[PDB]
Every structure is written in structure tokens, then in C-alpha cells.
Ligand binder design. Structure first.
Ligand code: HEM
Ligand code: STR
Length: 394
């Protein structure tokens, strides 16, 4: 029914190639069948907006088939709303700013410290991944190093959530989750005791108060903070750094005026998104204009296909932090499932980049070796760089 295409697993040293490829496809067809994901990809903005809104027709029930079953993302309707309110409490604005003061800022300074005394580093492994890892460590009360040991299992878990029709990816996802459950069980057990003094402890306490603290619910809260809070957040920071490093005049301006960091992050999400969109399951035969989707089909909403719509964002290939209005983020999903941790991720990007920019006025990309970009970078489910080598000193 749909044209076939390979939208995602395509390397380039041009960070805009991904955004431009999706926009190009959207001009050819509203829906394409991706040969690597093995599912229809919705590219048309009105179709995506409809899909996000009509949750009875476009559900997240595909997540009942894999490792997210039992967690928030797999829930629908009232069960979802009820668990969502619980999660919501911990990402309210005041809670976020409490995290910023009490640990994101000190951790950021510590991470930057470890970069001192070296002439060159890779800001991907040594910053973008380090900072979110240590934040989750703080929320768990467990050493960041412990999470670092899970990197490969974490990425294996995520790959199967996207390519959920691929038996090898799904099996490795399930197996990786099994190989991480000892860890997850240890963390849950510790912070579920009355002696817990961690944010995770407070969350488990809240689930307990609502009589929702089943083994699976508690494990899924930890799983989401790892998959989202650590791995997925890393790529947002990485892409924001690449955008600044690639545009040294904008980087200098941001260093001179760190109040611009929110605009740098948002434009970065338009210009170099780390995620394409979301998955939904079609619950009933539906037609979207001339396109028909059959009940039971799993689809991807590629909300980022509009990031490079020139009629919406002129000169879309230009990383312009001064755009008015600032682009609406498409990397957090939509509808009732819109990412609940996004406020934490956005704050970490700002607070970490501030600490970095202030400490190294000489910060610049190593002008030799260029980052290579693709969806699937480093075996992730992100579009991001393979490395971000910089020079820190003049
Ligand atoms: C740059 C960082 C992040 C990005 C781009 C991101 C992206 C996403 C996306 C695309 C979804 C699917 C939404 C949908 O189906 O509409 C999602 C959901 C979710 N994420 Fe985030 N994530 C990030 C960080 C985080 C963090 C830090 C946490 C935990 C603190 C988190 C926890 C969750 C949860 C629990 C869901 C399920 C929400 C629901 O179904 O209602 N994520 N995220
Ligand atoms: C529910 C949950 O833990 C969240 C936190 C991290 C999220 C994911 C983050 C990565 C992401 C990229 C996509 O394109 C599909 C949705 C996914 C695969 C998200 C699904 C749900 C996740 C796994």
C-alpha cells in the first residue's frame, strides 16, 4: 500500500541529513514503509496531530509485547492516567528546580572537573553520557559506575522497542532486560525500605501510598529512569553540544550569555533531533485522507518530518537560535503519552552545558576528525554523533 524507503540507518557527517531526508520523504508521500523498521512511518503533520489526539484509535498497546509491559508506557486509558499522575508529581517545575539546585548543578561541576588537566577529550563519552548517568545514580543512591556497566544491555533493551517486528532485536531486548533484573531488583529493594533517603525512595513511597507498588511497577519505574534518564538524555546533550561546536559564533554568544541556552537546546532539537518520533498501534481500521491503516498495525509517527519544512522554518538547514517563534519540540512524543521526564532532561542539558561553557573558554571541535551521524549511533535508538572530540584549551 505504501512506498518503501530506508529513512533511518543512513550515515552522514552532516547533522542535517536526517532532518532533510525525512522532509524529502514527506514531500513524496504521506506514509512510507521503512525497510529497516518494518512498519509504516507517518510523515504528514495533520496525520500525526490526529494520531496523537485520538488515543482510542492510536494506542501504545504495542508496548505490551516487550519489556515495557507493566510500566506506564504500555498502559492505556484510565490505568495510564492514574499512573501518569504519580510520575507527573516528580517532574513538576518546583521539583525540577529542586533537582537542579540539590544535585544537577554540583554534579555538572564535578563532571567538568574530571575534564580538567587534559588537552583533549571526547565530550560524548566524557560529558554527554557521564552527566545523566551520575544524575540517575544520585536519584537511585547507587554509584554511577554501576549504571555504566549496563550500557550495552541498555542499548539492547531499547533497540527491540523500536524494531519490534525483528526477532533478533526483540530477543536481545528481552534477554538484556533479564540480565539487568538483578541490578534493578537490588535498587528497588534498597530504596523501598523505610531507611531510603533518595528521590527513588520517595517515588516508591508514593506508589506504596496508592497501593501501586507491585514488583513490576517498581521495576518499571527504575527501568524508565535508566532508559530515559540515562541513555536517551545523553543524546539530547550530545546533539546540543554538536550544534554549538559546529557553529562557533553561536557557541561564543552562548558562552557570553548563558541565558540563551534554552533557545540553543530547542533549536538543536529542531535542527539535529535525537529521536524521530513515537510508536503507536492502530486499534481499528482507519483511513487518514486517502491512506488506510489496518487494525493491529504498529506505526511510527515521525513528528520530526516537519522540522525542515521550509514553509514553517525558513532556511531550515541553518542552526539559528534566534528563531521567532522557537520551534516546538518533536522529540518527546505527544498526546497523553508525551514524555514525563522531558523537564528533567531539558534542565540537565542547560545546567551541564552552562558548567562546560564557563569552564573552558577555549572549547572547540577538533577540526580534524569529524563526527559521523546516523540513527542507530553507537547501537542506540538515537540519531547522534559517534564522537565529539574537542580541544578544551587555547
Ligand atoms: C532527551 C531526553 C528524552 C527524550 C527525547 C525522551 C523521549 C521519549 C519519547 C519519544 C517517549 C514516547 C512518548 C509517546 O509515546 O508519546 C517517551 C516516554 C517516556 N519517557 Fe522520555 N525521553 C527522554 C527522557 C526521559 C527521562 C529523563 C525520563 C525519566 C525521568 C523519561 C521517562 C519516560 C516515561 C515514563 C515515558 C512514558 C510516558 C507515557 O507513556 O505516558 N524519559 N520519552
Ligand atoms: C517508558 C520508558 O521507559 C521510556 C523512557 C525512554 C523512552 C524511550 C525513549 C526512546 C524512544 C525513541 C523512539 O523513537 C520511540 C520511543 C522510545 C523508544 C521511548 C519509549 C519509551 C521509553 C523507553
Amino acid at each position: 500500500d505504501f512506498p518503501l524507503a530506508n529513512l533511518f540507518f543512513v550515515p552522514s557527517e552532516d547533522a542535517t541529513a536526517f532532518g532533510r531526508r525525512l522532509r524529502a520523504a514527506a514531500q513524496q508521500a504521506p506514509i512510507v514503509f521503512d525497510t529497516a523498521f518494518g512498519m509504516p512511518i507517518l510523515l504528514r503533520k495533520s496525520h500525526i496531530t490526529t494520531a496523537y489526539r485520538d488515543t482510542a484509535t492510536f494506542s501504545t498497546r504495542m508496548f505490551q509485547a516487550g519489556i515495557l509491559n507493566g510500566g506506564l508506557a504500555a498502559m492505556q486509558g484510565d490505568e495510564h492516567a492514574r499512573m501518569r499522575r504519580v510520575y507527573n508529581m516528580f517532574f513538576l517545575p518546583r521539583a525540577v528546580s529542586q533537582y537542579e539546585e540539590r544535585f544537577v548543578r554540583p554534579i555538572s561541576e564535578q563532571v567538568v572537573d574530571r575534564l580538567a588537566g587534559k588537552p583533549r577529550v571526547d565530550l560524548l563519552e566524557d560529558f554527554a553520557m557521564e552527566l545523566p548517568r551520575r544524575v540517575i545514580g544520585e536519584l537511585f543512591g547507587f554509584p554511577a559506575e554501576k549504571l555504566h556497566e549496563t550500557d550495552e544491555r541498555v542499548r539492547a533493551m531499547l533497540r527491540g522497542l523500536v524494531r519490534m517486528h525483528d526477532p533478533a532485536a526483540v530477543a536481545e531486548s528481552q534477554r538484556a532486560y533479564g540480565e539487568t533484573l538483578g541490578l534493578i531488583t537490588e535498587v528497588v529493594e534498597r530504596e523501598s525500605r523505610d531507611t531510603s533517603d533518595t528521590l527513588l525512595g520517595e517515588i516508591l513511597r508514593t506508589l506504596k501510598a496508592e497501593h501501586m507498588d507491585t514488583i513490576e511497577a517498581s521495576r518499571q519505574i527504575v527501568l524508565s529512569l535508566i532508559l530515559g534518564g540515562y541513555e536517551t538524555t545523553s543524546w539530547l546533550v550530545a546533539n546540543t553540544i554538536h550544534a554549538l561546536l559546529a557553529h562557533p559564533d553561536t557557541l561564543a554568544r552562548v558562552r557570553q550569555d548563558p541565558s540563551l541556552l534554552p533557545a540553543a537546546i530547542e533549536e538543536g532539537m529542531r535542527w539535529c533531533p535525537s529521536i524521530f518520533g513515537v510508536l503507536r498501534m492502530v486499534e481499528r481500521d482507519v483511513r487518514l485522507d486517502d491512506q488506510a491503516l489496518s487494525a493491529g498495525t504498529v506505526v511510527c509517527l515521525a513528528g520530526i518530518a516537519g522540522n525542515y519544512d521550509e514553509t514553517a522554518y525558513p532556511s531550515p538547514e541553518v542552526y539559528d537560535i534566534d528563531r521567532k517563534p522557537l520551534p516546538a519540540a518533536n522529540v518527546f512524543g505527544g498526546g497523553a503519552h508525551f514524555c514525563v521526564g522531558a523537564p528533567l532532561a531539558r534542565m540537565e542539558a542547560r545546567v551541564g552545558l552552562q558548567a562546560l561553557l564557563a569552564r573552558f573558554p577555549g572549547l572547540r571541535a577538533v577540526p580534524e576528525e569529524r563526527p559521523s551521524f546516523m540513527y542507530g549511533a553507537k547501537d542506540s535508538v538515537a540519531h547522534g554523533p559517534d564522537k565529539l572530540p574537542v580541544l578544551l584549551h587555547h
